[PDB]
Structure formats: C-alpha cells, structure tokens
Amino acid sequence: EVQLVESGGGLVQPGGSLRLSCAASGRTFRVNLMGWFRQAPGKGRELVASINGFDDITYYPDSVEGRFTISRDNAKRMVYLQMNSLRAEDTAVYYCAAYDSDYDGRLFNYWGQGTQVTVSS
Amino acid sequence: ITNLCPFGEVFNATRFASVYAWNRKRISNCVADYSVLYNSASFSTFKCYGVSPTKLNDLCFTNVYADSFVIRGDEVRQIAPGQTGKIADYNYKLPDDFTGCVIAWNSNNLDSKVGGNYNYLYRLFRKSNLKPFERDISTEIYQAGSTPCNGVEGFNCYFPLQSYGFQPTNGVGYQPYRVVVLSFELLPATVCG
Numbered sequence: 001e002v003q004l005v006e007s008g009g010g011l012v013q014p015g016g017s018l019r020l021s022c023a024a025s026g027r028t029f030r031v032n033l034m035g036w037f038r039q040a041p042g043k044g045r046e047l048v049a050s051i052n053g054f055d056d057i058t059y060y061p062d063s064v065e066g067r068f069t070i071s072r073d074n075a076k077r078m079v080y081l082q083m084n085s086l087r088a089e090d091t092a093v094y095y096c097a098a099y100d101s102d103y104d105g106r107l108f109n110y111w112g113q114g115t116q117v118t119v120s121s
Numbered sequence: 122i123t124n125l126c127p128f129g130e131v132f133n134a135t136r137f138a139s140v141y142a143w144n145r146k147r148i149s150n151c152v153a154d155y156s157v158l159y160n161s162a163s164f165s166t167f168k169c170y171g172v173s174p175t176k177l178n179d180l181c182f183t184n185v186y187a188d189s190f191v192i193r194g195d196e197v198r199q200i201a202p203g204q205t206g207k208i209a210d211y212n213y214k215l216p217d218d219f220t221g222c223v224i225a226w227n228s229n230n231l232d233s234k235v236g237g238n239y240n241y242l243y244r245l246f247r248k249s250n251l252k253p254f255e256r257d258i259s260t261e262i263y264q265a266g267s268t269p270c271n272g273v274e275g276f277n278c279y280f281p282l283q284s285y286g287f288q289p290t291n292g293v294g295y296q297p298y299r300v301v302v303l304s305f306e307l308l309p310a311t312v313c314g
Binding site for chain 1: 138139142237239240241242258259260261271272273274280282283284285286
C-alpha cells in the first residue's frame with residue numbers, strides 16, 4: 001500500500017514561521033511529484049505548493065508564493081513545506097499529496113492524514 | 122582567453138526535462154563551435170528556419186537560447202512554426218517568425234524503462250493555448266465541464282498532466298526523443314563563431 005505520515009505543525013504566533021514534513025512509506029511511486037494542500041474551516045481544499053522531484057521545478061499558486069516554500073529529500077522519501085510570516089488567515093489543516101500513475105498513464109493522488117496548524121495571538 | 126558556449130551541458134546532459142516543463146539555457150558572451158554539434162552525435166531531425174547553418178559561423182547573435190525537452194517521436198513534427206496539437210498548444214509553441222534551429226534524436230536507450238518510464242509528463246488540457254516560448258508549470262485541476270471544480274479531482278475535473286509510458290519495446294513513433302531548439306536573438310552581440 002501507500003501511507004503519507006505528516007509530522008510537524010502545531011501552534012504558531014502571527015508573523016512566525018513553521019516547517020511541516022511528510023514521510024511516505026509503501027510502494028514506490030511511478031512518478032516523482034508531490035504537493036501540499038490546505039483546507040481551512042468553511043473553505044474548500046486549496047493548493048499551497050507543488051514540487052516535481054524528477055525535475056527541480058516548483059509551483060506556487062498566486063495566493064501564497066513569496067511566503068511559503070516546498071522542498072524534498074528524495075533519499076528519505078521526505079517532503080517539507082516551510083511557512084514564513086504566518087498570518088491568522090493561514091489557520092488550517094495541511095495535507096500531503098503524492099501523485100502516481102496508472103497503467104494508462106492518468107495521474108492519481110495518494111493522501112496523507114494531515115496536520116493542523118493554528119496562528120493565534 | 123574567451124570561453125565557449127556550454128552546448129555539451131545542454132545536449133549531452135544526463136537527464137532532460139519534461140516537455141511541459143521544458144528547460145531553457147541562455148547563451149551569451151561566448152564563441153560557439155557548431156562543427157562539434159553535427160558530427161558529435163547522430164540526430165534524427167535537424168531543421169533550421171530563417172537562418173543558414175553555413176553562415177552561422179559568419180553571423181553574430183546577441184542572445185542565443187537552448188530549449189530542451191523530451192517527447193515521443195510522433196510529436197517531433199510539432200516542434201516547428203505554425204503547428205498544432207497537444208505539444209504545440211499546451212507545452213512548447215514556436216512562433217511563426219521562428220529564426221533558429223530544431224534538433225532531435227531518439228533516446229530509447231536512456232528515457233524508457235521496462236514497464237514504462239512515467240517520469241516524463243506532458244499537458245493534456247488548458248483553458249487556452251500557449252503563447253510562443255511560454256511555459257506553464259501549474260498543477261491545478263482542469264475544469265472540463267459545466268460544474269466548477271474545487272481543487273478536487275473528479276467527474277469532469279482532471280489533472281492537467283499525464284505520463285508518457287516510455288517502454289524499450291515501443292514503436293519508434295512512441296519512443297522517447299530528446300529535442301533541443303536553438304533560438305537566435307538579434308538586437309552589442311556577445312555570441313559568434
């Protein structure tokens with residue numbers, strides 16, 4: 001099977017920083033591209049960052065680009081997301097996403113449990 | 122002492138980029154050696170538009186650009202001006218006034234694995250076509266129906282990228298092909314021959 005185990009992420013102060021990590025265990029993925037998602041209470045699941053491990057190419061949606069950064073450790077099967085200048089808007093559950101391919105080539109997605117991060121004064 | 126352009130780093134690179142995330146290298150302030158380009162390898166495609174290869178040594182360009190990517194053989198015919206298709210519309214589009222060269226060579230011995238090498242991806246859908254030399258690297262789900270999508274894949278909501286299952290037994294048309302496009306800028310020119 002596959003299992004993304006997310007660690008890091010608790011309580012932070014507005015303007016502070018925080019690094020989340022995610023570790024994959026199970027079958028090796030046919031493709032190397034992962035991402036982090038953020039579901040806020042009362043909102044839909046949002047894309048925060050995506051990293052292609054085969055390449056050195058990262059993608060951040062216009063909502064958060066210069067503030068968050070995504071990195072990877074291929075040997076350890078780790079993926080990290082560092083968040084800086086965190087604001088109260090960022091309170092949410094952060095999820096791990098590991099993309100794979102089917103025989104046909106269509107890309108699907110494995111999910112981690114998610115870790116909650118709150119930014120309160 | 123004036124160094125030469127790093128064309129070996131581009132062509133003889135160990136790994137090439139996916140077509141959707143085609144890689145680009147700026148080539149300024151050097152003296153290029155085009156002789157080593159032709160006979161250092163066997164290319165299956167070498168087409169130049171708007172420029173002459175014998176006069177490349179006798180011309181000086183301002184800014185040269187080496188774009189590189191990987192696609193399947195069938196798609197090599199799309200890396201040219203005024204072409205359409207998935208690659209030309211959603212991956213790498215060359216302008217109608219392209220002044221450069223397009224080189225490509227089979228790579229089944231490096232970019233294909235038994236059971237499929239799914240690391241090389243390409244874009245299937247976009248809301249619009251790509252302007253010339255535009256790069257789209259977004260991984261937001263594509264809205265393929267009237268129902269809007271909320272960052273969740275599902276019915277009529279598809280991931281925009283798909284993997285080339287490059288196998289070593291595929292047909293020459295479906296095998297991997299490394300492509301290098303040499304764009305020539307004209308505008309102090311720091312490249313020569």
